[PDB]
Design a protein around this ligand. Structure first.
Ligand SMILES: [Cl-]
Ligand SMILES: [Cl-]
Ligand SMILES: [Cl-]
Ligand code: NA
Ligand code: NA
Ligand code: NA
Length: 323
DNA sequence: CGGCAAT
DNA sequence: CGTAT
DNA sequence: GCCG
């Protein structure tokens, strides 16, 4: 199979869930130690298993597979033979991993901040609440709605939110469209947030749209916290409500297919796609466009299909970008 | 060994 | 530093 | 951690 994740279809569900989940724990643990190189490899190795057409049953089936060296193969070997991987289980139990994972999942908290808190003796959320003086407003909101934000967002929630966003956007700018992106566009049934991409058919009209959208959303009393906009929405529930992370992104229609591709993901898929573009095609890709450094020109795109064709890749629908 | 996406 | 895919 |  191809070495780049953007060269292979990766469905949301596959046939090596257990194996890939173990490797991603090591990737997650690697990122907690600042080992971005090791995180990347373990992520790649896990994605390879996701792309396989059938379960891995023997170690010999790992031969030839990209990004599977000594360490990753050792992990799979133990899992196939003993049902568990000793290193993986040791990571799970450790106070370091559980704390870092707990801290980093807080909105407004990254690895660097989490590590510093761990080195100061902080272990729980109430520890962070015990000293609100050294908390930023984004972190204060992160701890404030942490329980709700830790609750999976369902498809039914997305539909309600999109109906809300479309209403505000529509009143903010006639003709402006709202596109669901993120993991939910890839076909996920549950998520930790909702991502929307907003544009307008007439180039330039999308300028200064977000403040108008946010104002009309706040007027409806739907914003607990907030061109991009990282918001925490108040989502109506049966007899109550819960907080939901929502991201609003505005782009000109000329750059829309690039913004759509980037914000649909997955994270690893986009990294592999941009790595492929530069290393194999000598082209520079981001959320805004595709640049030819030699010709000093930007590729024009009307769709995601255009971009894939520019890069010489077979088209992959969003539901096959779950790398 | 240098690179690892990109803003 | 944080945020997004 | 893996790759060229
Ligand atoms: Cl590393
Ligand atoms: Cl899902
Ligand atoms: Cl498109
Ligand atoms: Na976080
Ligand atoms: Na998001
Ligand atoms: Na998301």
């Amino acid at each position: 199979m191809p070495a780049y994740a953007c060269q292979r279809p990766t469905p949301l569900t596959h046939h090596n869930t257990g194996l890939s989940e173990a490797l991603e724990i090591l990737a997650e643990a690697a990122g907690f130690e600042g080992s971005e190189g090791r995180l990347l490899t373990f992520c790649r190795a896990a994605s390879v298993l996701k792309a396989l057409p059938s379960p891995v049953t023997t170690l010999s089936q790992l031969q030839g597979l990209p990004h599977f060296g000594e360490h990753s193969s050792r992990v799979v070997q133990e899992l196939l033979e003993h049902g568990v991987c000793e290193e993986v289980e040791r990571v799970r139990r450790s106070e370091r991993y559980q704390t870092m994972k707990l801290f980093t999942q807080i909105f407004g908290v990254g690895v660097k901040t989490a590590d510093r808190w761990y080195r100061e003796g902080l272990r729980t959320l109430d520890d962070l609440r015990e000293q609100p003086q050294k908390l930023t407003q984004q972190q204060k909101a992160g701890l404030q709605h942490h329980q709700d934000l830790s609750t999976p967002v369902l498809r039914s929630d997305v539909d309600a939110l999109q109906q809300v966003v479309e209403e505000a956007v529509g009143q903010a700018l006639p003709g402006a469209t709202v596109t669901l992106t993120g993991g939910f566009r890839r076909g996920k049934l549950q998520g930790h947030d909702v991502d929307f991409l907003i544009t307008h058919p007439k180039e330039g009209q999308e300028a200064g749209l977000l403040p108008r959208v946010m104002c009309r959303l706040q007027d409806q009393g739907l914003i607990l916290y907030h061109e991009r906009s990282f918001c925490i929405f108040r989502l109506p529930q049966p007899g109550s409500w819960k907080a939901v992370r929502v991201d609003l992104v505005v782009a000109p229609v000329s750059q829309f297919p690039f913004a759509l591709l980037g914000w649909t993901g997955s994270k690893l898929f986009q990294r592999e796609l941009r790595r492929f573009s530069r290393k194999e095609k000598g082209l520079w890709l981001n959320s805004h466009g595709l640049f030819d450094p030699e010709q000093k020109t930007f590729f024009q795109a009307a769709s995601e299909e255009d971009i894939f064709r520019h890069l010489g890749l077979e088209y992959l629908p969003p539901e096959q970008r779950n790398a």
